[PDB]
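Note to self: the last two entries modelled the partners one at a time, which told us nothing about the interface. This time every component goes in together.
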Amino acid sequence: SLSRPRQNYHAESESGVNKQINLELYASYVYQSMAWYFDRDDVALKGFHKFFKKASEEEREHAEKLMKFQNQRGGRIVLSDIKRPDHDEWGTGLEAMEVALNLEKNVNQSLLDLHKVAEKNGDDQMQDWIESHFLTEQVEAIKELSDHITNLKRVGPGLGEYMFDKETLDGD
Amino acid sequence: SLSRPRQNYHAESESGVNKQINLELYASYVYQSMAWYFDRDDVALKGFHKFFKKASEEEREHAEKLMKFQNQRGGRIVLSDIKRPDHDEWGTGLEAMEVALNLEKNVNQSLLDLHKVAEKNGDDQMQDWIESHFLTEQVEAIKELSDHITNLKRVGPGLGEYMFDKETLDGD
Amino acid sequence: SLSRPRQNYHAESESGVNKQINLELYASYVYQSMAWYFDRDDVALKGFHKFFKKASEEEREHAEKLMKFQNQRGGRIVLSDIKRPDHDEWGTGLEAMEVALNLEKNVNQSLLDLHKVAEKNGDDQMQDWIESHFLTEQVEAIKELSDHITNLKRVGPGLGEYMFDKETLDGD
Amino acid sequence: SLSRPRQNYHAESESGVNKQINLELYASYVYQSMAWYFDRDDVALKGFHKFFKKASEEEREHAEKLMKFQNQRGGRIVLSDIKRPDHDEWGTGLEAMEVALNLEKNVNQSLLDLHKVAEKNGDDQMQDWIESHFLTEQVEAIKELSDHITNLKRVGPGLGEYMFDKETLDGD
Amino acid sequence: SLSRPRQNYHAESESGVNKQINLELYASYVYQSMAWYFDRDDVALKGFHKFFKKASEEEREHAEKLMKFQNQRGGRIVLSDIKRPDHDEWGTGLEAMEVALNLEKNVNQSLLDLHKVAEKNGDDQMQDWIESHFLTEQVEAIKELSDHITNLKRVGPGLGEYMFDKETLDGD
Amino acid sequence: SLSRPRQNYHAESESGVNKQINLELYASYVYQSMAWYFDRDDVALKGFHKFFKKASEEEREHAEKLMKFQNQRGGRIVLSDIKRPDHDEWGTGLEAMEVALNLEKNVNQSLLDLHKVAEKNGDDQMQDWIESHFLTEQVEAIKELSDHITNLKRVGPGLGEYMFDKETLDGD
Ligand SMILES: [Mg+2]
Ligand SMILES: [Mg+2]
Ligand SMILES: [Mg+2]
Ligand SMILES: [Mg+2]
Ligand SMILES: [Mg+2]
Ligand SMILES: [Mg+2]
Ligand SMILES: [Mg+2]
Ligand SMILES: [Mg+2]
Ligand SMILES: [Mg+2]
Ligand SMILES: [Mg+2]
Ligand SMILES: [Mg+2]
Ligand SMILES: [Mg+2]
Ligand SMILES: [Mg+2]
Ligand SMILES: [Mg+2]
Ligand SMILES: [Mg+2]
Ligand SMILES: [Mg+2]
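The predicted structure of the combined assembly is written out below.
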């Protein structure tokens, strides 16, 4: 029995939105782990803390954008376990930014794959929605992380990392 | 002799925009009929009146969005009779909301069909225009009507219908 | 079974209000056709566009004044097809103003005929209502269109039409 | 090698804070599931939606209070999988409030158990911290849910549930 | 060695963005030539001057939108000579507006061709970006130039051209 | 047939102004290339980006100052191809500032050479105009670039370049 709103919305698209929901929540958890790693007394970079804390809140917003979309189209949210991140510790500011870029590139591919499911099933509204909410925001996030990685390599460790935290990440 | 602006704009697309203009004007007329039905002394629901009056004005705005688009692309507006609605009377608030949802789903399909004409003829700008102006607005309208139908069934007839008119539709 | 409000309201008057509703909606559609004709890239007169767009919205307001009146007196709105206008194209600014005047004079007669139905059936309130809402507004509209026609003949075609659009119709 | 801040902070307390972090994140996920269930077109209670959405954000704040505390005391955050909730669907507003109360009572016990670990290990600051941040907030949350359950039983299903959503939960 | 941001970005798309950069800069130079032609003591139309000066600045902004896009996607800007325009002199206001429309239609085709390269290579983000930034803006620019050409033919040479400069182009 | 304004304005001066127009536009293009090089994900210096972007806009303003001057004196603007810059890549912040200084010194000589043409032909107004608009502005630009080069050598590569971008160029 099809939900009352449902029109031009395919079971593969509905299932793909649930898979993207879990990935956004997973990315939220990775950024949360990194945020609180930078609050450790033996790491102590408030800029990096604030940056990954905000990244974590944004990913949970992405998850909730997809939950609202699922309900708009008359699909049904199915939640899965949010897997713990692969590491308890995240190294230097540079190493954490590289992990961030690799995560954002994996989320980007997964969004393009979900756009392909929409396209395969003739879902013109879902393709446009993914384009409006996600595809350009992911390009912007990937360029920003690439800029940060270039600058963290330019400033180098020690004082450089500290000044990057103060200047680019507005630490404090 | 092609109009001065005309570029990548197919006769099938031009004709499809005229057909969508008439459908938007038709939907405007159905909502107008329902609006003034709720102003009857023997129906007397100001919330429902205000809701369908606004829906009617929006559909005429949709019609005028398509008239402006036709002229932008160098096509020519051709108007047809606006058929009277299928009923003089529209029953209960619940029955009118169900008629609304069925109308919005028929307008939605017709917009996806017009997007398919654009796509078939390689009209990338017209596909994006339909996506920006219509496809997401239709999804939102269909979800809102589905929410209203669920709530009108929850509150039930009599006092429930009255309180829905006061609370959700801000009657008065 | 007479509606609860109904007092001194004759079946001929009720039927005449439904006929005037359709005529107001028809006039609305003619003005809408002319409005969007003046938005064509090959006509391109923003003053004329704005003038007929406003005329169109006013005629739909007239239609809704009569719908409210029908319900006030305990009559029942019966909607008919809104016939498409007699032309797709409307010529020069002067030619469109002459079509406007001829339409307003036909709506005026039809209002005087409806006033005669009210009078024949002793409906003192309906005669006064038509006088308050319509008869003087029609005289004003006819005088304004006659003034515009005189001025469009004075300024002549080409630059004159352009300056009339800028000065009298406040184009832009 | 003990972290630089660490003083009077026992391995059992550190491990108990990580277990409470996962429970707060779990409760956050249950409230998130319930929030978006109430946004379904076939459930459509904006008050319940807003209430569980806020409850979800608060539980994630609780999780982050414990992450900050772990780092303050020189312990180390260890994250585990956030288990999916036990249900995809949550029934009536009344049924969801009862699930909420049962969850808050299980989180409450778990906080008293964590306070007992602190007490067993002579951690006077950690006992006071749990008292300041959690023990009274849990009593308040449990009393509020008990009040809501009493009122949802008083108003009854259908119109009652709708009016509770409008009046007590400020729906819209 | 692929740049750090690069994902789903094809060499044909990168090369097409460099070709569109040069075309936008070329169009900027044509509008600049026309702007300063209208500042000649023997042409002296401040409205036309201001209009083509703004058109020139906008085209250079288009060029810079594509430079930012190239860098966002991890491609590399390659600049070519900006060819001088085909004429030193641009005739009447009407003749310059017709040259403008022909230029905007050639830039429009070139944007649709670049969208086709994006589409051929499955670049969903680049297609949406071209749609958001360019395809509708080009339709609007072409309709405006078509409107101006219609009006410059309506007003005729001499006084008409002067009044068009004062009224539509706000000369001074 | 001499233009109506022309007085004491020599063909050599008119031709020299057209040559300076092309040089200013060339310098604009070099600064634009350098601006967008500093926006590359693998260069990523917002201060340098903003500095060369502004330098580029100023050089195009210089070009337009000379176009206005040509028309004031009754000469005729003749535009040539704007040659692409000699490099796609511009190295370190220090290397780009040295390229800037060398460009500004070549533009300076070319302005003194144009002043000599004015002087040779007794054009007292054109000599004063070049003095007022250009000769002191070039001295100021050359001193500023020399100061920046001294400071980029003082701070050294890596962190020094980053801090120069933040402090002297107000990056962000
Ligand atoms: Mg995300
Ligand atoms: Mg794809
Ligand atoms: Mg699209
Ligand atoms: Mg868009
Ligand atoms: Mg519509
Ligand atoms: Mg389709
Ligand atoms: Mg009327
Ligand atoms: Mg009479
Ligand atoms: Mg009176
Ligand atoms: Mg909690
Ligand atoms: Mg105890
Ligand atoms: Mg352009
Ligand atoms: Mg195409
Ligand atoms: Mg210069
Ligand atoms: Mg000298
Ligand atoms: Mg001097």
